[PDB]
Structures are given as structure tokens and as C-alpha cells.
Symmetry: D2
Subunit: 226 residues, 4 copies
């Protein structure tokens, strides 16, 4: 019994390339009103773009405001914005660790916090964080990345336990290797950006209403374990 | 880009009532060719029914043959056929334990194994097992049910590790408390008591389970294998 | 402060060889009163043996009675009795599936259920199930074994949720590749092949499994219930 | 077949009170050489104390050095040092989030990184991080705490995948409610500091050699789930 479609105001952070762009274009094809953040490179044709560095809480504030004026308060937030700085643990610096934590984990916090008020008050919110298989699988040479992506799971679950009663859910999509090593992947191939985008499409839809606190692996089976 | 829809040959076990019927109706409205199993009562209008008890390996074989002849070999299998025989461990009998294991876990095996050849051969398969939050969350008085539903996760993961290379995936949907006839038959003590453990602070609907199955049966689900997707309002979060 | 040691009445199923024997010897050196089950070969010197097939509920009952008479009712149960019947899913029979389920999963139920009254009554119980990394990691060609070992996790968690209030806990030890006679019987293709997936880059020993069981049977383990402890050199990490 | 005891040089961060003190005193009773960090309050009688704020990478450096001079390079590191700053997500500040991340997660990184060289070269290391049930269970009003404690799991698993081959393991102990709410706990009681300390004792022993990347819950069953 399929629920009627609702055009949601969407913000995809880092929505101008790779996986974020694929998500942005898919959600736009689904019928949503899609805004993206970026910083310098520019937004894709058709979609509303706003400049944000997610390490800047004030810049995150006036991005949401700019989006609210353009297409209504963010109802679906897709936190994709991140980066890596891999190294052997012994080789890894305080600076390299903190820069990845600040962008990937604290940056996710900044957008989630900014999103929360309007979602709580309108009794609707979908926070969808793009994590990684690395979070709970443990890829070597990414103590910073893995900490950030596991941390977003913890963050999302705390939010889910607090805000699900207000119809504000928080879920993580955990992509494996995505073409934007093969021995570890049962499917014996990398995934496509469209394969990540299709899962986000599902999480942003009326069909995902009773899913909250979930980590959905999109990794051809790579991340299976405990 | 959204992948073009493909009408798939679908079998839903226990698809004649409750969650299974909600799943089967949704999959049929999606555009798939939907068959359901039942144990005599029949299948409802607009669904091809095949009679099978999933504890009977020979009956499972014949059911798949009747489906293949009607609508083509099974491409999407939804294994929903379930039952429970709850008791305190101290009280639980070998009979109660084995009965639930045979239907829920070995029955899931029977239908998966019967499906596999054709799915491997055609390089397309979606096995979707309806599990339970109980599997990894631990509900008391459910040693048999919890064992069966955790068992299907193990089974689905071994299958995913083996056959994902052939475009045959195996996933589990793990519903929490869903409003059915049986959940809404017990008094408000256990029902209100359960809401305390659900961050959503409400029961789920059969349609909300059906919506997730629809996703997993769609073209958008191709790179998900060995996943357990909880549909439980957050109830089952943990490790 | 380290809690004072208590000599516990211990039953280790499948405690006459391999990992089970390593466990039983360690528990006996720890200071416990250790009994082992076997299926005829006998128990080794310094261990009280009781003959039982864990597919036989009546034999399980009699084994526990013989243990109770010898050394007091079972306080610490180590359920190790296991077997595998590996095959491609396509190849796997109902017989191979049900056989492994009955011994590994229902057999674990039988011994747990027989243990429970006495443990609940005396307000002390430690059930320790020897599982497998395979349960949640997914090893190919192990649909039956993986289902059984994931199933014991579900079972142990339901038991933990029910009986933890009575100081009766239920935990799982999930070994990875451990050097036994059977792992060291296959050629170096599968053995070296497995090392690639183990961060430790070596096989584990029976003693390393026994050491974890010792911890879980000790007074230091009182607030651990429903846990799965992997002893696998990191092999099974994931979700 | 119990392996012979080895007296290890131990550093417990935040080892002067609550759970950290219980761990420190237990590891000392086990026969290890036990050092603790603190900051102002002082160390317990008998045990070597060093002043460190784990947000200070240079202070972490000269603590390890001071310990190495006193009792040999750290062979077992117990990262306990942390803190909370709970709030509703909407109520939670960038400052509150970052202070908990910096102390609990980045602080764990600082000590692990500093420990890594000597452990790798001596082909022995045991890193034991004190996490929390909150990491994967998702306690409301601790988006910062839960992010930090889930993040340490990811961090530990990345380290485990890199360094386990060198006999350097990384494991997390995840305590539930510890007396230093009851409806969520199967055991129907809180745990004791000694109950946490006993698990750390096990992880620091010769019996834990083949455990790496593990999260061991010490929570009376509270945290069960997925
Ligand atoms: P939900 O929570 O709404 O589920 P539910 O109401 O409990 O229904 C369980 C479903 O599984 C089927 N089922 C149970 N045991 C079976 C068996 N061993 N063989 C074949 N089908 C079986 C039932 O079919 P039937 O009860 O119609 O046989 C039913 O459709
Ligand atoms: P590890 O890897 O070293 O394990 P292993 O060598 O494969 O040994 C398995 C253990 O489990 C026992 N076992 C298997 N099936 C059993 C059954 N159904 N009833 C009672 N015991 C059973 C075996 O006892 P037996 O083979 O001696 O019966 C044996 O001690
Ligand atoms: Cs559009
Ligand atoms: Cs469209
Ligand atoms: Cs149709
Ligand atoms: Cs339709
Ligand atoms: Cs003894
Ligand atoms: Cs001894
Ligand atoms: Cs000492
Ligand atoms: Cs001592």
C-alpha cells in the first residue's frame, strides 16, 4: 500500500561531485526540491547551490537560511561532506586526525544540529549520513577516517533515540568501494554512485518512515561481521 | 539515474495474510508478477496461490515448479513464513524449540535452496528473509524464535558470501513490533510496555515493512548483500 | 580487588578432544571440578566423563544427573559440541542442513534448558557457548554451520534477557581459524588462503580459546551477559 | 594450558578515580608495573603518577617519556580518560560537542599514536580503550559522547587491522551503567568498578593474545542489539 509522494526540501552536503552529485541528481529526479552545498567548484546545472565549509558553524547557519528562503526548511538532510587523510598510525599526525574528525564527524554534527529545530517543530525530519564500511570493518591506515565514520553511527543513534518520537529519524548509509581490494568484496565488483543514490532515494521516501538508527551497507557484502 | 523497472517473478511465502499479504499486494502494485504460498485457505484475488508447508521439502519443490509454469522461475523470493512458540527457557520443550526452528529456519533454507539454481543460472536473484529485531536484540521467552531469526541472518550471510558474484543477493528485513491481528490480541499491558523500548513511540504498520521489501526487490537494491535492515522505529539499536 | 576464586561444577560438552579438551584441561587447572561429555571414546585422565549425544534430550538429562551426583549440579556449562557438513547452497541437502542444526543449535538448547532450573534456583549460572566467527562474518559453503552459530547467539541473548536477573548469564565465544587436527588436515591452499583475512596473520591455538572460556567461567565475568567475544585475530570485524 | 605471567609496564589514563582507579589498582594487584595519568587531583598511593591533559599532544609525549624512564616503555595502554557534556541535540553547542570529541576520541588517538612506535618495534602491544554502551546503543542527549565512544571503536579496529600482525592488538571495553535506567538492564542492577577492572585485567593478560578489534560489553546485557 504505497504512500503518496511528497516533494521534500532537500539539502545534500558535498552535493557537487562523485557520490554526492549522484544523490543530488537522483533526489531531483524523484521529484524533491534539491539544494547542495559546495565550496568554490560550484553546483551542477539545475540545482540550487550554496557555499559552505562544514567546519564553520556560522557558514552552516546561513546556508540553511539561504536554502529555507529558496525552497523551505530542510526536511531531508543528506550529510555527505567529507574527506580522508590516510596514514599508518605511527605516521599519522594530530593535524591529519583532527582535520578529518572536524570535517567528517563534527561537520555532520553542525548540519544535524542546525537541521534539528525545524524538523522537530514540523514533526518531520530525515537525517541521512553517508558513512563508510571502514567505520566498523576497520580499513588499515585510516584511524582518522574510521573514527569519523564510526562516530557518525553513534551520533545518528543518539539522535534517533531522542528525536524519532517527533518523526525525525537518523540513518546511516555505509558505502563500500564505489567507483568515483576486490578480494574482500563478495559481489566481486565495485559499486556505482547510482547504487548509493538509490538507497538514499529510499531513505528520503515515504517508505522509510519506520527505519531509524539503521546502518545500511551498500558494499556488495564487503562489510559483513560484528 | 533511476534504473528502469523490471517486472520480476516473485514468490512470497506466508503471503496470504498479515505482513506477508501486505508485502505481496505492494509487490504486485509495483508491477511484479506475484505468487504467494499458503496452507489451504487460499491466496486472495490478484495473486497466484500455491499450497505448501515449508517443513516439506517435496512440497516446496512442487510449489516452485507451479510458479515457474505460471509466471517464470522465481527471481525474487520473500521468505516470510513464520511462527512462534514462546516460553520461559525452563518451560520450553524440545518440541516447541524444534517446531519453530523447522518452520522458520530450516523452512527458509528449503525455499532458498530450491530457488538458488535458477537464480545462479540466470545471474539474477534476490532472496529477502523476514527476520526479527528479536534475533540480535534478545526478547525474553523467545529462545526458539530468537534462535531461528538470528539463524536466518547467518544463513543469508553465507549465501551472500557465496552467490553475490552471480548477482544473487541475500538480505534480511528485521521488523520490530508491527500492528497485526496477534499483536493487537494481547491486552494493553504488553503493548504499552513495548512502546517504552521503541524510540518512535508507536507500533509499525504492515505497509512500512512492505515498503522496505519493495525497495529490496527493486533495481535500486543491487549492491546490498548480507544486510540486516531493521524496520523497528529504532527499537533494536545496539551491538 | 580480585574476587576470591570459587571452585565451580563445570560441564564441557565435546570436552574429550580438540578445543573442548583444551578448555576442559584449563578449567581443571584453574581449580574447577570439570566433567566432559563424549560419545564413547571416553574422557581423559583427570576429567569425569559422561556419555551423551546432544541430539538426545533423554541422554542429556541423564548426563546432568550423573554430573550432579559426582561433583554437584552444573554451575558452569560450556557448550562446545559441534560439527559441520559444508557444501555449496545449491548442493546442500535438507539432511546436511538439519543434521548440523540439530547437533549445534538444538543440542545447545538441550543442554542449556537442562541446566537452567538449577542455575536459576541457586542464583548462579554461567552458560558459555562456543560459536563461530562464521555466524556473523559469512563463510561460503557454510549455510548450515553459519545458521547454527548465528542461531546460538540469538538463543544466548534471549536467555540473557530472561535470566540475567537471577545471576544466570549466557555468553558466546566466537573462535576464528584455530589450529586443530581438521584445519591442519586440508592442504596449504585453504590454510594460507585464510591467513589473508586474519589481521594477526596466524592461526589461533586451542589454548587461546581456552583462556577466554576461563575468563568467562571466572568471578571477573559476572557483569558480562549476552556478549559475543571473538577469538579470531581480528578476522570477523564488521557489522 | 595457562601461559606464564609477564609483568607489563602499564599506563592507565585517568587512573586516579572511579573506574580508572579500579583498573589501576587491579592491574597493580595482578603484578604489573602501573602508571596513571591525572591532572591536579593527584595519583593514588603506591602507583606512579604523571600529569597529562590528553588534549595536549606534547604533554602526552612527555608523559610517556616520564613513564618509560620510571618503568619501561608502555606495553599495555588503557585509555580511560574522558568526560561528558550532555544536552538535547537542538540545545547542544559546537563547543560542547568538540570538547568531548577532543578529550574522548582525539585524546584516545594521541595516546595510541604515542604508544604505537615502541609496541610495534618490541612486537608487543595491548591497547585497551574504555568505551561505552552508548556508542552503539544510542543514549539520548549525548550526541557528543556517543559519537566519541563509537568513534573509538572505529579507531581501534583500524589500528587492529594495521598492527595485529606485529602482536599489537586494540580492543574496547564498553561499560554500561557503573556505580561510581535499571529497566533497560537485564541484570537489574548497575555494575561495579571492579567488574570493569576484571575485564581489563583479562585483556592485559597473556590469555587475550588472539582477541583484536573486539568490543566487550560489561553492562549486564543492556547494550544487546545491532
Ligand atoms: P505476520 O506477523 O502477520 O505473520 P503471521 O500472522 O504469524 O503469519 C505467519 C505466516 O507464515 C505462514 N506459515 C507459518 N508456518 C508455516 C509453515 N510451516 N508452512 C508454510 N507456511 C507457514 C502462515 O501461513 P498459514 O498459517 O496460512 O499456513 C502465515 O501466512
Ligand atoms: P574443535 O574444532 O576441535 O571440535 P571438533 O574437533 O570438531 O570436535 C567436535 C566435538 O563435539 C562433539 N560432538 C559433535 N557432535 C556431537 C553430538 N551430536 N553429540 C555429542 N557430542 C558431539 C564431539 O564429540 P565426539 O565426536 O567424541 O562424539 C567432539 O568432542
Ligand atoms: Cs525536479
Ligand atoms: Cs521521475
Ligand atoms: Cs501487477
Ligand atoms: Cs504503481
Ligand atoms: Cs582440579
Ligand atoms: Cs593453577
Ligand atoms: Cs605491584
Ligand atoms: Cs595477586
Amino acid at each position: 500500500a504505497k504512500p503518496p509522494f511528497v516533494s521534500r526540501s532537500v539539502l545534500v552536503t558535498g552535493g557537487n561531485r562523485g557520490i554526492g552529485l549522484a544523490i543530488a541528481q537522483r533526489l531531483a529526479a524523484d521529484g524533491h526540491k534539491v539544494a547542495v552545498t559546495h565550496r568554490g567548484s560550484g553546483a551542477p546545472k539545475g540545482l540550487f547551490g550554496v557555499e559552505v565549509d562544514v567546519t564553520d558553524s556560522d557558514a552552516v547557519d546561513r546556508a540553511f537560511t539561504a536554502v529555507e528562503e529558496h525552497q523551505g526548511p530542510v526536511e531531508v538532510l543528506v550529510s555527505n561532506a567529507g574527506l580522508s587523510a590516510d596514514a599508518f598510525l605511527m605516521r599519522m599526525t594530530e593535524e591529519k586526525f583532527e582535520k578529518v574528525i572536524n570535517a567528517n564527524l563534527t561537520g555532520a554534527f553542525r548540519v544535524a544540529q542546525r537541521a534539528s529545530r525545524s524538523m522537530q517543530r514540523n514533526k518531520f525530519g530525515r537525517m541521512i549520513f553517508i558513512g563508510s564500511v571502514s567505520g566498523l570493518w576497520g580499513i588499515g591506515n585510516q584511524a582518522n577516517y574510521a573514527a569519523s565514520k564510526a562516530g557518525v553511527i553513534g551520533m545518528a543513534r543518539s539522535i534517533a533515540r531522542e528525536l524519532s518520537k517527533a518523526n525525525v529519524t537518523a540513518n546511516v548509509v555505509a558505502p563500500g568501494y564505489i567507483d568515483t581490494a576486490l578480494q574482500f568484496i563478495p559481489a566481486k565488483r565495485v559499486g556505482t554512485p547510482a547504487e548509493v543514490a538509490g538507497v538514499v532515494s529510499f531513505l528520503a521516501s515515504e517508505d522509510a518512515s519506520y527505519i531509524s538508527g539503521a546502518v545500511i551497507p551498500v558494499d556488495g557484502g564487503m562489510g559483513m561481521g560484528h
